[PDB]
Amino acid sequence: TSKWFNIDNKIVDHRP
Amino acid sequence: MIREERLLKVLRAPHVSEKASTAMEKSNTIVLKVAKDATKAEIKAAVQKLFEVEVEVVNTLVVKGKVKRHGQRIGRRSDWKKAYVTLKEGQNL
Amino acid sequence: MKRTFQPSVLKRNRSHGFRARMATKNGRQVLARRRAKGRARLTVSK
Amino acid sequence: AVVKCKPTSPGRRHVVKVVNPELHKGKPFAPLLEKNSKSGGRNNNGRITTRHIGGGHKQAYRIVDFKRNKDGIPAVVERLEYDPNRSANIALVLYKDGERRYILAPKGLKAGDQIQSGVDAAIKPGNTLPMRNIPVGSTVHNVEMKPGKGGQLARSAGTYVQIVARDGAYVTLRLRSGEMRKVEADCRATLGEVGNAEHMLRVLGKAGAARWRGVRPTVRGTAMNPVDHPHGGGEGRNFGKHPVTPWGVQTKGKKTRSNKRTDKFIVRRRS
RNA sequence: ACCGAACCGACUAAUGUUGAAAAAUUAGCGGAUGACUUGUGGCUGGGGGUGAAAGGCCAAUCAAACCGGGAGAUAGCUGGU
RNA sequence: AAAGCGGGUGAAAAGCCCGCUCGCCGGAAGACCAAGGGUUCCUGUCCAACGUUAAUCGGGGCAGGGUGAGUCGACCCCUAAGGCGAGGCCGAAAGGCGUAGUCGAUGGGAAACAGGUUAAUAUUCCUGUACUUGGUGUUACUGCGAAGGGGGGACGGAGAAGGCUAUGUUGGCCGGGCGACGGUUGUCCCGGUUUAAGCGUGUAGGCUGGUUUUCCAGGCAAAUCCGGAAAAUCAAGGCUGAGGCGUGAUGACGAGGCACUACGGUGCUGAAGCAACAAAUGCCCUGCUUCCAGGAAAAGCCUCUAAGCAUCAGGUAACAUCAAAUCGUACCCCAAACCGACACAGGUGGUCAGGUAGAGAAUACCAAGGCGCUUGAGAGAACUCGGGUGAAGGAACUAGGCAAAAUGGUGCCGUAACUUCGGGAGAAGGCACGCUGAUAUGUAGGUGAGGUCCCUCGCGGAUGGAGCUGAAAUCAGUCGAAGAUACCAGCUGGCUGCAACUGUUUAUUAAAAACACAGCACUGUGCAAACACGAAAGUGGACGUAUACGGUGUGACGCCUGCCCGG
Numbered sequence A: 001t002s003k004w005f006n007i008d009n010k011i012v013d014h015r016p
Numbered sequence B: 001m002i003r004e005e006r007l008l009k010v011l012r013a014p015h016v017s018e019k020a021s022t023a024m025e026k027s028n029t030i031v032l033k034v035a036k037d038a039t040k041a042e043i044k045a046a047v048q049k050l051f052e053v054e055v056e057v058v059n060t061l062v063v064k065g066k067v068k069r070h071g072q073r074i075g076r077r078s079d080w081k082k083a084y085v086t087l088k089e090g091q092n093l
Numbered sequence C: 001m002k003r004t005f006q007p008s009v010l011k012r013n014r015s016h017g018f019r020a021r022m023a024t025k026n027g028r029q030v031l032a033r034r035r036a037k038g039r040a041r042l043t044v045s046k
Numbered sequence D: 001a002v003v004k005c006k007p008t009s010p011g012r013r014h015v016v017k018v019v020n021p022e023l024h025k026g027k028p029f030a031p032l033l034e035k036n037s038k039s040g041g042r043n044n045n046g047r048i049t050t051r052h053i054g055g056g057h058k059q060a061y062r063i064v065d066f067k068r069n070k071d072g073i074p075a076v077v078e079r080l081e082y083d084p085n086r087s088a089n090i091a092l093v094l095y096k097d098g099e100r101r102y103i104l105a106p107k108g109l110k111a112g113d114q115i116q117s118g119v120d121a122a123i124k125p126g127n128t129l130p131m132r133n134i135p136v137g138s139t140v141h142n143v144e145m146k147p148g149k150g151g152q153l154a155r156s157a158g159t160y161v162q163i164v165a166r167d168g169a170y171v172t173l174r175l176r177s178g179e180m181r182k183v184e185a186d187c188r189a190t191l192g193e194v195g196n197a198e199h200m201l202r203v204l205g206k207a208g209a210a211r212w213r214g215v216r217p218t219v220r221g222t223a224m225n226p227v228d229h230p231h232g233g234g235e236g237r238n239f240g241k242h243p244v245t246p247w248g249v250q251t252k253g254k255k256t257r258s259n260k261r262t263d264k265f266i267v268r269r270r271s
Numbered sequence E: 001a002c003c004g005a006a007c008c009g010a011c012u013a014a015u016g017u018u019g020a021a022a023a024a025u026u027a028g029c030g031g032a033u034g035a036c037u038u039g040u041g042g043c044u045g046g047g048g049g050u051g052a053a054a055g056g057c058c059a060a061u062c063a064a065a066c067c068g069g070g071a072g073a074u075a076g077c078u079g080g081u
Numbered sequence F: 001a002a003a004g005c006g007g008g009u010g011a012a013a014a015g016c017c018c019g020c021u022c023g024c025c026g027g028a029a030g031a032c033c034a035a036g037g038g039u040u041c042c043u044g045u046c047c048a049a050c051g052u053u054a055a056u057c058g059g060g061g062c063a064g065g066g067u068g069a070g071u072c073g074a075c076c077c078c079u080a081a082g083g084c085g086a087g088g089c090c091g092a093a094a095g096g097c098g099u100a101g102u103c104g105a106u107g108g109g110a111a112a113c114a115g116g117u118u119a120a121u122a123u124u125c126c127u128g129u130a131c132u133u134g135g136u137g138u139u140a141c142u143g144c145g146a147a148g149g150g151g152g153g154a155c156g157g158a159g160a161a162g163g164c165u166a167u168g169u170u171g172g173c174c175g176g177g178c179g180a181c182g183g184u185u186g187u188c189c190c191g192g193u194u195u196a197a198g199c200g201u202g203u204a205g206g207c208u209g210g211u212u213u214u215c216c217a218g219g220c221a222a223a224u225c226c227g228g229a230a231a232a233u234c235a236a237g238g239c240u241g242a243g244g245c246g247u248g249a250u251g252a253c254g255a256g257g258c259a260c261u262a263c264g265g266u267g268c269u270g271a272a273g274c275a276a277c278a279a280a281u282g283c284c285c286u287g288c289u290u291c292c293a294g295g296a297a298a299a300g301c302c303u304c305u306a307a308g309c310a311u312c313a314g315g316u317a318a319c320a321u322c323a324a325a326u327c328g329u330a331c332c333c334c335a336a337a338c339c340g341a342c343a344c345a346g347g348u349g350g351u352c353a354g355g356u357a358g359a360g361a362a363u364a365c366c367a368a369g370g371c372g373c374u375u376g377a378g379a380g381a382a383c384u385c386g387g388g389u390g391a392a393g394g395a396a397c398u399a400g401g402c403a404a405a406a407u408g409g410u411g412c413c414g415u416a417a418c419u420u421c422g423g424g425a426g427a428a429g430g431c432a433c434g435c436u437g438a439u440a441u442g443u444a445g446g447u448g449a450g451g452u453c454c455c456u457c458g459c460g461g462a463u464g465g466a467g468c469u470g471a472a473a474u475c476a477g478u479c480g481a482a483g484a485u486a487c488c489a490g491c492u493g494g495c496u497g498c499a500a501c502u503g504u505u506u507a508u509u510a511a512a513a514a515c516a517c518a519g520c521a522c523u524g525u526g527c528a529a530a531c532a533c534g535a536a537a538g539u540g541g542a543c544g545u546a547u548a549c550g551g552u553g554u555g556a557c558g559c560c561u562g563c564c565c566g567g
């Protein structure tokens, strides 16, 4: 499936 | 009354094993492989009238099939019934 | 963790068994579809 | 009696309970009990049709004689009993011929009393007469709507129906809603207010007491989401809507009675 | 009601994060006769259910499940030719 | 949770087998099941593949064996929730509901225990001793009969105590020992001291007044049954019931001793086999007391009659005989066999419940019993993880005392503001605590033999204290740095926001001030109720009736809730 650090929100939305 | 057709069909085979031999030499019991749709009364009548002996009681159990492998092709050895027939101390087949 | 399959033969047979398939009208359609495909096993009974 | 509990715990601080020493303490009458299963507010389709019903204590139904049809035979009121299916107390009453029945207990009736039904019965509480025989101005309860149907009006605890007029074949009853209704003069009615008036003075004291009576919690539409209730939504606490039921009909003032079949019988609304 | 095991839960910290585990371990933590918890069985079905209400849950999937079908939807867009 | 060594087998041994140690669990990591799985069970043989290494081993391959029932469970009779549903009501069709019925356990219904045996089954086989239901046939008496009436089955939460038992400890008795190193013929050490269902008696306890007449608008008709009414008469009659005792049992079992062994285990014999005390969460007890939230149904069972049969059938009691079929029974079951893709630190319902200390099912160490977690051997860098201790200082760290450290038990003294008079409160704070002797060769208390007396006469009562068990306290002495010595086991106080409180919530980053709440107000609703599900029939609301039900908002309690109808 998918990696947890890609599902996470604090590190994915790192540069809004 | 149970017909001779039915009796001659229900008795299938004797059974040979260490436990069957011990039962014969200890409790005057014979072990018979029996067709599956035979009841205790049918086995008792068949033994009593075909082996010319006399039966105290009969005990039945169904032996389950075995899952086997023949060249990576799965198969299933079939069921049969086993009968422990007890005789009245003076028959000695 | 408790997973989604907690098996029970009675509930299995009342839900997906052959007599429930024949009881509902669309279950008979399910059996028709599986027979037309040619399944070895139609329902969960065998 | 109305007895306040001492505040030895936060749940028991506000509790007011009604204790009645005259009630029977043993088991009720096995010939007259029945089972009823709880529904949870679910109909034969299985859907919740009435919200906030479910759980509570298990109960047994008591067959209560609302018809009061055994006329001409005097009856001895034996004992008062707790019925869990209604607010009022029931009374196990022994007729003179050996058959026992459950009736509603009117106010003032006690153990070992005399009651009697029929057209020739005396005018005293507990006695059942047709309202053509019942004098005007007198308070009755357990009032019928159709002759022989059974009692349907003034059946909860402490309620009564006042006969104000008799015009030909119909009598006018003032009902506890304040409502004037014409009913047939042949309909039966039992004299006297229903007992257990102190039932209205109870305080449950806790959510546990409500759940014992069998009512699930009520969620406000203003706390729901917009997809759930017409009131739901808002950042913070926002309402901005006219108050409606969850299916969209206005719920503060909008009248919902529409029965042109019984508009002929209704004389005055409850105002 | 109170303290505290079973049992139910999940407040804090560290570890783990291609893990022993697609949500746990360790040390502490809350309830623990009640609006409690649990076994077997039944019922409610997708614009529907159920919801002490978080758009939560409905088989590791939910601002509308899964499966097959209209279906080779459409794509003024990207890639390839 | 942890291994070491000796021997055996083998081509080869850290892992397999045997032995001696060492360690871990022991309300489980032990034993038995239900659910689920399906041969994983036992024996012989093999090491390609599977096993996170090797392999002689295995839950792997191959072959053979193994599951024995009138009494256990299913099947079967009976119903719950609910399902299906002849006719029927309804709906474009399909189909929706539903009466009579008929299914549906998670519940109600008859009966077996102890010992022994197999490599693998046993409440199933064998030995011993029992019990249940039904059919047939003799004997004796006789009003039998339901799809109907009645009783019963038949029922909640909490609490308290009495009587007991399982069970344990000690004593007695029986068998054995006189100790690798000071002492050990003694108040010394080790072990054993088990016995069931059934049958007989009916005790502690619990419930209820019996017995005989006459009458009756009730129990869909009848009733000798149930209910009701009026008399007479008697006072102990009935029902239920743990345990104990006798029998079952001159039997079985029994530490050990004796002899073979294919050293794995077999064959023979066998003493004592009692008492006191402590004691359950188990039994009497589906009891008793109390509370409000007022606590399944039907059949089996007992009983009464209708139609009918009427010296027949049928019923009751004894005896004899026959029958009780069919299916499951191996093995795992807190797990390497079930659900998690794995021989996966997860999950999974019930039953049993030993010793010491302890309030205890916590916890520490142990017993029965089971394991050492399928890679090891070295070395003793940085660094990471889990811990231990630390001079002086003591929050100076940091967003923040996060984390860690500390407090921690029983008895007594004592304890503030505030308060809804309950609380706050274990407020805060302090003192004692080990061991030996004496009071007292072991006390107060508990249990209670022998003996004696009495009797409506035995499982009886009064006296009486043998014996057993046994706190707590005071005084004196003594040891240590320290006596709740380990494990286990509150940090406390002050000001304040919010929500009254217990609870519920985003399974899987949010447990909150959100949701709920008891209480309050408005409003709808007269019953064929409003309202909801449904093209409809129906159903919930409710077998409820305005002191009730639905909707909406606020949220205990105290003081309050002011003006505006223009939109």
Ligand SMILES: N[C@@H](Cc1c[nH]c2ccccc12)C(=O)O
Residues within 6 Å of the ligand: A003, A004, A005, A007, A008, A009, E017, E023
């Ligand atoms: N990383 C954590 C938490 C986690 C699981 N799934 C996630 C998905 C998204 C973010 C975090 C997670 C874990 O592996 O258990």
Ligand SMILES: [Mg+2]
Residues within 6 Å of the ligand: B057
């Ligand atoms: Mg036999």
Ligand SMILES: [Mg+2]
Residues within 6 Å of the ligand: B060, B061
């Ligand atoms: Mg069998």
Ligand SMILES: [Mg+2]
Residues within 6 Å of the ligand: D051, D052, D218
């Ligand atoms: Mg409501």
Ligand SMILES: [Mg+2]
Residues within 6 Å of the ligand: D218
């Ligand atoms: Mg409310």
Ligand SMILES: [Mg+2]
Residues within 6 Å of the ligand: D223, D224, D225
């Ligand atoms: Mg919201």
Ligand SMILES: [Mg+2]
Residues within 6 Å of the ligand: D226, D227, D229, D230
């Ligand atoms: Mg809307």
Ligand SMILES: [Mg+2]
Residues within 6 Å of the ligand: D235, D236, D237
């Ligand atoms: Mg705002």
Ligand SMILES: [Mg+2]
Residues within 6 Å of the ligand: none
């Ligand atoms: Mg505004």
Ligand SMILES: [Mg+2]
Residues within 6 Å of the ligand: E001
């Ligand atoms: Mg509590």
Ligand SMILES: [Mg+2]
Residues within 6 Å of the ligand: none
């Ligand atoms: Mg939760």
Ligand SMILES: [Mg+2]
Residues within 6 Å of the ligand: none
């Ligand atoms: Mg959290």
Ligand SMILES: [Mg+2]
Residues within 6 Å of the ligand: none
């Ligand atoms: Mg934890």
Ligand SMILES: [Mg+2]
Residues within 6 Å of the ligand: none
């Ligand atoms: Mg608490």
Ligand SMILES: [Mg+2]
Residues within 6 Å of the ligand: E032
């Ligand atoms: Mg607690």
Ligand SMILES: [Mg+2]
Residues within 6 Å of the ligand: none
């Ligand atoms: Mg939102």
